Each structure stands twice: as structure tokens, then as C-alpha cells.
Amino acid sequence: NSLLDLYAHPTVVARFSEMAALHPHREAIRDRFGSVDYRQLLDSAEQLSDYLLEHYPQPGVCLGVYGEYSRESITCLLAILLSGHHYLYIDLKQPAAWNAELCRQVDCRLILDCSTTPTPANGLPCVPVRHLPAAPASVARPCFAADQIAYINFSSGTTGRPKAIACTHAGITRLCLGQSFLAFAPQMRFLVNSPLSFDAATLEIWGALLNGGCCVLNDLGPLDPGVLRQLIGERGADSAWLTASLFNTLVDLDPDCLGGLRQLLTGGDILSVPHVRRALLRHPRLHLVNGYGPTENTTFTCCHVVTDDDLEEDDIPIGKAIAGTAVLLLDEHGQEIAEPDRAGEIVAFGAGLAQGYRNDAARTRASFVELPYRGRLLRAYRTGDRARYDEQGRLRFIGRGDGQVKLNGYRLDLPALEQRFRRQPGILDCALLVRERNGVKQLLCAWTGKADASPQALLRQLPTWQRPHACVRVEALPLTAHGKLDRAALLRRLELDPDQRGCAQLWSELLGCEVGADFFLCGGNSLLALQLVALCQSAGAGANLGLADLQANSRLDQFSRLLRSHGLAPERLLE
Numbered sequence: 001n002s003l004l005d006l007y008a009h010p011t012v013v014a015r016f017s018e019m020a021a022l023h024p025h026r027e028a029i030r031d032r033f034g035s036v037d038y039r040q041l042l043d044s045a046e047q048l049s050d051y052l053l054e055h056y057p058q059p060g061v062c063l064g065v066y067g068e069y070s071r072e073s074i075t076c077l078l079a080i081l082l083s084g085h086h087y088l089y090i091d092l093k094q095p096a097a098w099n100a101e102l103c104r105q106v107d108c109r110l111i112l113d114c115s116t117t118p119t120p121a122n123g124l125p126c127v128p129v130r131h132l133p134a135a136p137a138s139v140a141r142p143c144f145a146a147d148q149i150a151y152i153n154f155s156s157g158t159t160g161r162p163k164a165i166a167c168t169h170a171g172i173t174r175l176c177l178g179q180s181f182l183a184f185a186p187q188m189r190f191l192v193n194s195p196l197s198f199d200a201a202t203l204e205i206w207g208a209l210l211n212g213g214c215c216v217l218n219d220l221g222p223l224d225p226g227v228l229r230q231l232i233g234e235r236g237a238d239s240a241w242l243t244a245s246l247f248n249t250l251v252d253l254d255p256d257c258l259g260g261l262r263q264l265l266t267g268g269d270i271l272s273v274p275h276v277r278r279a280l281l282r283h284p285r286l287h288l289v290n291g292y293g294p295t296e297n298t299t300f301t302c303c304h305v306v307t308d309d310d311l312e313e314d315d316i317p318i319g320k321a322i323a324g325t326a327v328l329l330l331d332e333h334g335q336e337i338a339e340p341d342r343a344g345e346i347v348a349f350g351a352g353l354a355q356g357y358r359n360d361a362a363r364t365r366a367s368f369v370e371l372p373y374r375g376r377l378l379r380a381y382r383t384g385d386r387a388r389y390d391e392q393g394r395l396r397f398i399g400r401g402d403g404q405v406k407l408n409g410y411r412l413d414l415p416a417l418e419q420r421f422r423r424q425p426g427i428l429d430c431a432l433l434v435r436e437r438n439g440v441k442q443l444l445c446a447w448t449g450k451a452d453a454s455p456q457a458l459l460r461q462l463p464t465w466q467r468p469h470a471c472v473r474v475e476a477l478p479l480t481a482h483g484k485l486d487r488a489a490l491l492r493r494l495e496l497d498p499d500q501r502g503c504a505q506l507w508s509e510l511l512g513c514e515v516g517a518d519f520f521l522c523g524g525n526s527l528l529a530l531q532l533v534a535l536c537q538s539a540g541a542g543a544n545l546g547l548a549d550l551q552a553n554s555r556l557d558q559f560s561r562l563l564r565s566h567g568l569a570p571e572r573l574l575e
């Protein structure tokens, strides 16, 4: 209270400059090539900023960044902030129209290309930053207030129209300073892994840099037991965030791969108590935290440090408001719930509140409101998350009233996506389901219509994380006696060679889908692909990669051949 006030918090750049001044020789960044210390990071960043200010001397413009984590991409984030501008991650894994739409929404001037590999941009103004000329020698940095935009993340956008959520310097410095839920210290080594399109990345990067710690970048490829083990062992990562279902996957595959971490946060969806239990009894000294919050409130709203006693609950508490934030639980009538075991909506106040939804006034007025807190009448955001208090005054997550789902940490408005499928030519009806198989989520799509009507165009237009893992055509969507989609019925519906029939039984058991002579059109996804590859490696492989045998071999023709290359299909069943 009064930390709820944006102006009580410093700028990202003021705080970083403070760190760089105190800790010139501490590792700021550790990548495959070495480390960069604070003084070096600061210089590089200032130089690149000299270039930016030359081309965009007026504070407050949106600049893009592309490429997987590198010393250059971090440096770019810093240079952008230093110039009074804000960053937008343009993911080139995504379809052109989608990225172009983002850029239009925030008026993205120029993209700073750190991509190691050749950029097939072709619509967009990319400038490669590596080996850049070293422009005119200095510029005074604008001294902006803490309410300046640091970065943009987008609303789901399953309508086809994603809305920009502008987050502020104060949101970040609030997140990273004066907290109790994690120990932020100069000795911390934070794994930088999460997709920079979304807000866990915020914690992983700024948590370290604002505290004099080191960012340990994953430049080794998708996170899995071996890569994690490597980032911990060789590079000394002691602190990490993992979206709940990735945490689940790792714990199931190789629980000891968590060994060496002092601090681990997970969240982004409802935590699995069994997996939390296994990680904790496996690693009794681990400081484990359940982080909760919407992008609109900047990374975290509530966090809960996990205890022994929690391991007997049906759900891990999401705990309490972080410093610089406040929450209320509201009834249907708008009055705060003061007592245990009574469900209501989570409402948020404080320094984490984002600007609103750029170019959407209605959404903005709907969830960004003024509401009384204590005495004062404060700006607030309504999460749409139903929770309840427990005996100890800790929040306990219930769920949502609208159709919004988390798909392995990704935010989707499912109804709008479904409707998007209905609009496709020759498609009568469509049902979208998210499934909880194997600690992980799957997005399953069943549609009715012309037999030729499969919506491949639409899928090519969807950002990758919005594409169903299975698209099946059906006779009809099963209705119950009450007229409601019969979900169990639907999932139920969704269920040759010597070794070709083995691969397809395996895939069936793992995916919950069909045989007949493709994994990622069959209900596979990146997490399940991890598990499958790990099985295959248990079996006398590991020349068999996440890349080779699955993506290059994804048919089950190509996979029955890649399998029958080294070993037998029936063996994996008991591995």
C-alpha cells in the first residue's frame, strides 16, 4: 500500500545502472561462448542505444527483436529500454500475417535481428545487430518516469485479432525488488529459457540483471533433462522458472535433472500435486514456488512458497500478493470476501498493472476499472479467476467462468478459436477440447462438414501454439440428452507391418489417438515428443534426437523405419 503506486518504483535502466556500477565484474550473462560482465553489458547496450537514439530520438517507440536467446538479444532489450523505447518479440516461427498484425497493432518501427540463422523476413524492416558499425559516439539518455512502457505482450488473439498489453518499467522493478517469495541476490544464476513473447521471460531476465546476478541463457535447444542438467552443471544455473506442464514432464522423465537448483518456480496453470510431491521428496532442500498471475498484472500477482503440509492438499495454494501488488476477492455483488471457503473473483491493484488493451476500449473498460481498496479508490484489473481463501488466509485457485484455457502455459480463448473454425468454408460445426494427459495438455479439434473441408488454410494462419494437435472429421458432435456437447463421448470417439503396427500402438497409448500408417497431426505435441524421444533413448538410442527421428521422421512410416533402424517397436512398451 503505497508500493501499489507506480512512482515508488525505479526505472529498469536506473536500477540496472546501479547494479552495473556496484558490480562491474560480476557475470551478467553466460552463454555458450563465455560470459559478459556488467560493465561490458552496459557498454555494449549503450553503444547500440547510441544507434537507436540516432534513428529514433523521441522516447516511446516500439522496437522489435528477433532470434533465440543470445548475448545480442539481451543487449538489445537493454538498449531499447535505455533509449526510452519498449520491446516486442517477433517470433519468426510464426506466420507472416500474424507478425505483421502485431507490428501494426503497436506500430513497430524496426526489428533488431539477432537471429543466427538467415532471416526470411520479406515483409518486415529487419536490421542485423551483430558487427554493427558503432554509430555516433554518444547520446544523452532521456530520463523517463517509471510509468514508461518497457515491453508489449499480446492477448490471446484467437478471434484473429490479438490485442497489445503494454507493461511498464515499474511493473518489472516491482516484480524484481523487495520481494519475499524468492531470494533475488547477486549470486543468483537464473536460467533464461521462457519464450520472450510472454511474461515469464521477464522474471528470468530482469530478476537477475536488476539484482546483480547472472542470466544463464539456454542456447542449447529446447529444455529437456539433458539440456537442463547441462545448464546447471556447466553454467551453474541455480534458479529457474518452468511452466507447470514442463515441470511435470521433467519430473516424470528425470527427477534428478532438477538437482543443483536452489530455487525453482512453476505455475502458469494449476500445479499437479503428485509431481510437486515427487520433486520435493526427491530434492528436500529445494525452495519451490507456485507463481500465479495474468499478463495484465505483469508476471506475478500471487506467489506461494510450497511446504510439506501442502503436499497433502488437493491443490497447491497460490498464496498471497507479491510486494507492489494487492488483491481482493470479490463476490457477485462487488463486496470483498473476508472469510475462508467462499468463492469469488480475483481482483488486482498496484504497480504491476499494465496500460490496458491497445486499440480495444471495450475490453479495457470491462476489466480495467476503479475499485475501492482500503480507504482509497484505486485502479484495478479484474482477473476473471475464481479463487477462495483457506484457513491461513492463502488463496486457492478454483478456475474460470469464461472459455479461456491455458495450453501448456499458453493463454487461449477457446470459444473464439472454435468459432474461427466454424467460419471455415464447408465446415458445419466444430468442438475444441483441452486434455490433461500425462501431466501435459493437448488441444483436440473435432469438426463436421464436407469430407474435403479440412481447414488447412486456417491452421497455416494460426500461431503455432494455437494449432490443434489433432484435427478429426466426425459424423456429428455427440450431444447429451440435455443438448450439451458430450465430451467423454467425443474423446472416446477420438481413440500394417511387423514393426509398423507396434509404433502405432505406442503412439496410441501415449497420445490417446489413432493407428493407420502422423504424430503431430495425431495428437502429439512438443512435450509428448520429448517423452517419446526419451522412451526411445531408454531403449538403446540417443543418436535418436528430438529433431531427427520425430520431426524429420514424423509419419510413422518414417518413424517405423527410424525405429526399426536401431531397435524393435515392442520393446519400448515396458521402458
Ligand SMILES: *P(=O)(O)OCC(C)(C)[C@@H](O)C(=O)NCCC(=O)NCCS[C@@H](CS(=O)(=O)NC[C@H]1O[C@@H](n2cnc3c(N)ncnc32)[C@H](O)[C@@H]1O)[C@H](N)C(C)C
Residues within 6 Å of the ligand: 194, 195, 198, 199, 200, 243, 246, 266, 267, 268, 269, 270, 271, 290, 291, 292, 293, 294, 295, 296, 298, 299, 300, 318, 383, 385, 397, 400, 406, 407, 408, 409, 410, 411, 525, 526, 527
Ligand atoms: P511445445 O508446447 O511446442 O513446447 C513446450 C514449451 C514448454 C516450450 C511451451 O509449451 C512453453 O513455452 N510453454 C510456456 C508458455 C509461456 O511461457 N507462458 C507464459 C506464462 S503464463 C503467464 C500469464 S498468462 O498467459 O496470462 N496466464 C495467466 C492465467 O493462467 C492461469 N494461471 C497462471 N498461474 C497459475 C497458477 N499458478 N495456478 C493456476 N492457474 C494459473 C490463470 O487463469 C491466470 O489468469 C503468467 N504470468 C505466469 C504465471 C508466468
